[PDB]
Each structure stands twice: as structure tokens, then as C-alpha cells.
TrEMBL record, chain A:
Binding site for heme c 1: C37, C40, H41, H57
Chain residue ranges for the region called Disordered: 287-307
Domain Cytochrome c residue range list: 15-123, 167-281
Name listed for the protein in its UniProt record: Diheme cytochrome c5 peroxidase CcpA
Residues bound to Ca(2+): N65, T237, P239
Cofactor: heme
Cofactor binding description: Binds 2 heme groups.
Binding site for heme b 2: H185, F241, H242, M256
TrEMBL record, chain B:
Binding site for heme b 2: H185, F241, H242, M256
Positions bound to Ca(2+): N65, T237, P239
E.C. numbers: 1.11.1.5
Major subcellular site: periplasm
Hydrolase among keywords: no
Cofactors demanded by this protein: heme
Name of the protein in its database record: Diheme cytochrome c5 peroxidase CcpA
Ranges for region Disordered: 287-308
Residues the record lists as binding heme c 1: C37, C40, H41, H57
Domain Cytochrome c: 15-123, 167-281
InterPro entries to which the protein is assigned, alphabetical: Cyt_c-like_dom, Cyt_c-like_dom_sf, Cytochrome_c_Peroxidase/MauG, Di-haem_cyt_c_peroxidsae, MauG/Cytc_peroxidase
Swiss-Prot/TrEMBL keywords: Calcium, Electron transport, Heme, Iron, Metal-binding, Oxidoreductase, Periplasm, Peroxidase, Signal, Transport
Gene: ccpA
Species of origin: Shewanella oneidensis (strain ATCC 700550 / JCM 31522 / CIP 106686 / LMG 19005 / NCIMB 14063 / MR-1)
Any single Gene Ontology cellular-component annotation: periplasmic space
Length: 307, 308
């Protein structure tokens, strides 16, 4: 089969994953002292804010839909345009992004380094108490690699449990293959293995200006070519597409069939397609909320409002 | 001894607690779909946002410092001005407060009732799958009552363990008593047993307009009379006072000694006091980040920007 099962994450650097988990939930990575990775990739809600575009520092309206951190390591690159190569490189972006955490790499590292409890952990992981952006993002990336979603009802079906999904869902997987969805959405993450044009046969209408891969490569052929997203946990990651325009998976599957394949789905076919896509929802990360250390007199004060 | 030990939470109703935890972390209880109770009472950082005052809907600056939910069921009343009797009544407020979650009770219950997984849990706890603010806030309060902080160094000391706290911290505690702090800050939560004047001997110098109890009662005698906060986990719940004006416990202790007692602390005395107070940090809630059900076609969409 073109779709493969996701296996539970193997943790090989436990101290580092713990430090990463703390940092993913650390709102003092932001200027406000209020926004953490979790604010926009909420692990209680499919690893996303579930908004059309993000709400950032000062309630600024973000330019693009927040994708899920779930199974993000199976992606060939990171961000919609693939401008980051892995999760460690990606993590540098939000901290310093004015529309997101609104901080700087220098302020983030000073903030974390103010606290002996954090310094002790960087020392255990990397060899001394220095905090720099490489270590901080490396730790975050190590944690994110644990956020896989094994044991979806579909995975149980691929492993031979014929009763793990409905007949609607089984017919939907067949449609998925037979219509050509799988040509772009395949591998363990049902997506994430390639860049492809959004609007291959028919243009995709949006008033969102994001040009995708063209903004990394400079190639006009790369205009509106985006990373193919994962369809794992697609049930949870509404609204859909990079512009957050579509709230129902019903409409997303029909928009994809219409513009990627040249023909929308029937009522029955949509029912089946959605059934299959929901069966891709895996076991969500079970994480204990991390207990973060107190700020001290050396910790930069947050600036939620004026100064 | 005027301070008592915090015992671990007796969990008698774990299904309700579970439901309560989900709702406490549920950002779809806010109009924006972005703010939950945990936003302002962040359980990773002492049950508080650690901001001078809170960030609400549309990034509004709130009027007062968000208190910790840790040990809050020990409080004689809820809110700085004591306007809510207990955690259940309290929880109704923020959901409908325009400067906080900015939602309505009607929309909150419709939002939760839209999802079969939520309806199933309400049924399992209350007997049918109807959602109203009564059951919603009952479940949240059930979860909050579990958020006690046992096993602090000072508790170990009260129980007899002499090396539980430092020499400084021991001197700290005798000073806390001898100077009269314990007249207002006592019991299991080292606080929350009474409302007292902020600025008993001298005025509290603040630019914050909050009136305290007078705002609720109208009485001139209740002016700047506030619920005495818990000092449990005071290490973690900076900045201090209802105006969130002071970031160090050093300043906080000196301000109190001065304006509540007419007393000035030696540097060694302030350091002793701060060591004592630091010893009041207990074991933090150990909880699993709740997995919330997906919205569906009957779930009201979040409204992060629109005025309607
Ligand atoms: C260090 C903290 C953060 C981490 C580790 C993180 C993680 C990630 C990852 C892995 C991706 C790419 C996944 C993919 O392309 O499929 C991503 C993209 C994105 N995240 Fe975050 N995130 C963080 C902070 C934030 C915050 C605070 C916000 C909102 C204010 C946010 C909103 C977004 C948006 C809008 C994108 C897509 C941007 C683009 O494609 O250019 N992220 N994040
Ligand atoms: C009917 C068959 C298909 C179905 C049901 C389907 C399903 C989906 C869904 C549900 C999304 C939204 C993901 C998200 O927002 O996180 C999506 C996005 C996407 N898919 Fe498909 N897909 C199909 C066919 C294809 C084909 C044939 C291609 C390539 C030719 C493709 C490439 C993409 C791309 C580039 C995106 C991101 C588009 C954007 O938001 O700009 N898909 N797909
Ligand atoms: C239903 C969700 C919430 C719950 C269960 C909750 C819990 C509590 C509790 C127990 C108190 C009183 C504790 C005490 O006075 O000792 C309180 C007060 C307070 N909380 Fe929340 N909270 C919620 C939502 C929020 C949000 C979203 C914000 C920020 C936007 C916030 C900020 C505050 C503030 C500023 C106060 C003090 C207000 C006053 O004294 O008048 N709360 N909360
Ligand atoms: C040196 C002795 C004292 C110390 C070290 C002390 C400690 C503290 C601390 C650290 C706070 C900040 C709590 C927070 O912001 O959450 C506080 C607040 C408070 N304490 Fe004390 N306290 C002392 C004496 C007193 C006395 C004698 C009274 C009553 C007469 C009192 C009543 C209060 C009240 C009403 C508040 C809240 C005031 C406000 O922010 O509006 N304290 N105390
Ligand atoms: Ca989405
Ligand atoms: Ca405080």
C-alpha cells in the first residue's frame, strides 16, 4: 500500500526531549510573556489553533493557516513554502517573527539563561550553561519528534484489522487511490513527501497572496506550489488549506477533486472520502503539562502592552 | 502553629474532574477560540499568567492581577473583592466577561453541547447530555479543587523535619509571626481567611483604581479592603499585589512590613522572610494535557476579530 503505518516515537535523548517540552510551552519565549508554541500549535486540539490564520503578538492577524506540529518530522521540509529544512531550523522563525512571538533570538536566550533551572538542563544536554538559539531550537525539535500519532483506525486496518474502519471508510481509501489523491498524499504521513501546485488542473481562488515555493526558489513555475500537507489528523486541523478558507472536510475534499483532478466528488463519494480521512486520526500525544521555573531579577520583564 | 499543612487532593469524582480539566483548557469557551482558563492561570507557571494584569479578548489590558488557581478552594471567597462565594460561582464570570473570554453563557453551552464527546461526558457525570452553565462550572470547579500543592519544604518542617528548610527560612517564619504578618496570612493557605485593608498604617501607593470590597458592598469602610491572598507558591506568582506592580518578593515583603505594620526590615530580616516564603512553594499539579474533541458543523466557529 502507498500509505504506511506510523510507529510510536523512540526517545533516545530523554533530558533533551524534556527541555524541549518545557520550551514548547514556555510563553517567555515571546515578547508578551503570553504566547508559546502551544498557543498556535495547541496539543489539546490537533496541534493547531484551529483558526483561519493565527492570532499573534498584540492580537495581530497572521498571514497563513497554522499547520499541525503532529507528524511534522515526516515532512520533506517545513513551512508551507519549505523555506526551512528540518524542525530545528523552523523553530528559529516563530521566536523572532513580529506577527507571532514578536521576540528576538537574543532576548529569548537571555530570558531562558536568566533561570538556573533552565541553565542546569542546557548543561546536562550540551555541556555548559550557555543558552544560544542553536541549542534552544535543537531541544524544541527533539521534543517535536515525539509528537507522532500512531494507532489510527486506518493504521489498524493496514495491519489487518478488517473491522477497524467502516465500509464507507474502506470505499473512501479505494477512491483516494483510484482518483489520484494518493499521487500527492502518500507515505506514512499521507502527505509531506513533495511540493505540488495548488490548482493543478483548475486555479485555486483565494484572496490570500501567499505564493508558496516561489518565495524560496524565485521560480515562476513554483508559484502557488506548496508542501503537500499531511492528511493525518485532518479531522482535527480545520479550517483547511493555507488560507484557512474552508471549515468542512466535505468542502475541502471537493475543492481538491475539482481543482487538482478536474472533477468534484458525488455526495456518496464525499461521505466515503471523509470517512476514510477521519480514520487517519491517530493517538494524540499524552503529555504531562510541564512545570516551568520562576523568573528572577535577571529575567527580562514581559511587555504585553506598552513600552 | 497558625499555619497548617496542605494534604493531597481527595479525588472522589474523577470523571467530573476529567471533564473539568478539558473545559479549563478549552479555548472554544472564549469568543475568539484562543483563550482558555489556563491562558490566565497557566498551570505550567504557578496557576497565573505572571503579567501585571491579564490579556483578554482582542488583547485588552485587564484591570487587575490574575490570582493563582493553586489552593484557591481554601479562599473564604473568590476574586480580589470576594464577589463570588466559591469556585463554581466564580467560573461563570470570565466566560462572559468582555475583557476576558468575551463569550456568552448561551454560546459557551451551545459550543460544548455541539460535540458528542462532550455530551457523552456530561451524561456520564450528570445523567443526561444537556449542557448548561451550572454543570459546566460545576465540572470546572471539581477540577480546580484538585489543584492543591502539598509537600512544600515548610510543610515538611511543620511536620517536624528540621532540615526541610534553611536556617534563614526558620528565622523567616518566626519573624512572619513576631512582626504580625500571620495576623492576616494564616491557616493552610497562609492567607485567604479574611478581607483586610491594603494600606492599614500607610496608604498603598498605586495608580490602580480598584476599590476592593467597596466595589461590591458600596461601603466606604470597605475601600481598598481586599481578600488576603494565599502566600503558598508566592515564589511563582509574581508580579505581586492586585496592581501587579512589584516583581520581587523582596519589595513585596518590605511594602507589607511598612504599610500594614509600620515596620522596616533589616536586609537580613527581609532575606530571612523571603527564604521562608520561598519554602511555601509546593508540589505543582501533575496533570495530563487534555485532548479535546473536534468541532463539527453545529459548533459555532471562533470569532477572533469580528465584532458580531
Ligand atoms: C517555537 C515555537 C513554535 C514552534 C516549535 C512551531 C512549530 C511549527 C512547525 C513545525 C511548523 C511547520 C509545519 C509544516 O510546515 O507542516 C510551523 C509553522 C507555522 N506556525 Fe508555528 N511554531 C511555533 C510558534 C508559532 C506561533 C507562536 C505561531 C502563531 C502566532 C505560529 C504559527 C505558525 C504559522 C502561521 C505557520 C505556517 C507559516 C508558514 O508556512 O510560513 N507558530 N510551526
Ligand atoms: C480528491 C483527491 C484529494 C483529496 C481528498 C485531498 C485532500 C486534501 C486535504 C483535506 C487538504 C487540506 C490539508 C490541510 O489544509 O492541512 C489538501 C491539501 C493539499 N493537497 Fe490534496 N487531496 C487530493 C488530491 C491532491 C492532488 C492530486 C494533489 C497534487 C496534484 C494535491 C496536493 C495538495 C496540496 C498542494 C495541498 C495544500 C494546498 C493549499 O492549501 O494551498 N492534493 N488535500
Ligand atoms: C472559566 C475559566 C477561568 C477560571 C475557572 C478561572 C479561575 C479563577 C479563579 C478561581 C479566580 C479567583 C481566585 C482568587 O481570587 O483567589 C479568578 C480570578 C481572576 N482571573 Fe480567572 N479564571 C478563568 C478565566 C480567566 C481568563 C481567561 C482570564 C484573563 C483574560 C482571567 C483572569 C483573572 C483575573 C484578572 C482575576 C481577578 C479578577 C478580580 O479580582 O476581579 N481568568 N479566576
Ligand atoms: C511583613 C509582614 C507581611 C508579609 C511578609 C506579607 C506578605 C505579602 C505578600 C508577598 C503579598 C502579595 C500577595 C500577592 O500579590 O499575591 C501580600 C499581600 C497582601 N497582604 Fe500581606 N504580608 C504581611 C503583612 C500583612 C498584614 C499585617 C496584613 C493585614 C493587615 C496583610 C494583608 C494583605 C493583603 C490585604 C494583601 C493583598 C493586597 C493587595 O494586593 O491589594 N499582610 N502580603
Ligand atoms: Ca488547517
Ligand atoms: Ca501575582
Amino acid at each position: 500500500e502507498p500509505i504506511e503505518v506510523i510507529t510510536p516515537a523512540k526517545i533516545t535523548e530523554p533530558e533533551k526531549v524534556e527541555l524541549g517540552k518545557m520550551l514548547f510551552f514556555e510563553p517567555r519565549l515571546s515578547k508578551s510573556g503570553f504566547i508559546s508554541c502551544n498557543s498556535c500549535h495547541n496539543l489539546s486540539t490537533g496541534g493547531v489553533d484551529a483558526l483561519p490564520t493565527s492570532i499573534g503578538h498584540h492580537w495581530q492577524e497572521g498571514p497563513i493557516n497554522s499547520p499541525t506540529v503532529l507528524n511534522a518530522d515526516f515532512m520533506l521540509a517545513q513551512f508551507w513554502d519549505g523555506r526551512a529544512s528540518n524542525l530545528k531550523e523552523q523553530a528559529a522563525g516563530p521566536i523572532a517573527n513580529p506577527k507571532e512571538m514578536g521576540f528576538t533570538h537574543e532576548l529569548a536566550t537571555e530570558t531562558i539563561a536568566s533561570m538556573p533551572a533552565y541553565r542546569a538542563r542546557f548543561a546536562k544536554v550540551y555541556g555548559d550553561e550557555k543558552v544560544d538559539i542553536d541549542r534552544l531550537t535543537d531541544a524544541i525539535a527533539a521534543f517535536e519528534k515525539t509528537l507522532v500519532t500512531p494507532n489510527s483506525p486506518f493504521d489498524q486496518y493496514l495491519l489487518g484489522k478488517q473491522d477497524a474502519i467502516s465500509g464507507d471508510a474502506k470505499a473512501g481509501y479505494q477512491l483516494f487511490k483510484d482518483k489520484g489523491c494518493v499521487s500527492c498524499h502518500n507515505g506514512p504521513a499521507v502527505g509531506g513527501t513533495m511540493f505540488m501546485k495548488m490548482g493543478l488542473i483548475k486555479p485555486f481562488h483565494t484572496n490570500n497572496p501567499a505564493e508558496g515555493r516561489k518565495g524560496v526558489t524565485g521560480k515562476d513555475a513554483d508559484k502557488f506550489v506548496f508542501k503537500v500537507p499531511t492528511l493525518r489528523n485532518i479531522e482535527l486541523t480545520y479550517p483547511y488549506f493555507h488560507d484557512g478558507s474552508v471549515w468542512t472536510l466535505e468542502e475541502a475534499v471537493n475543492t481538491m477533486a475539482d481543482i487538482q483532478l478536474g472533477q468534484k466528488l458525488t455526495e456518496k463519494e464525499t461521505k466515503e472520502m471523509v470517512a476514510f480521512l477521519n480514520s487517519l486520526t491517530g493517538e494524540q500525544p499524552q503529555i504531562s503539562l510541564p512545570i516551568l521555573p520562576p523568573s528572577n531579577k535577571e529575567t527580562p520583564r514581559p511587555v504585553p502592552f506598552a513600552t
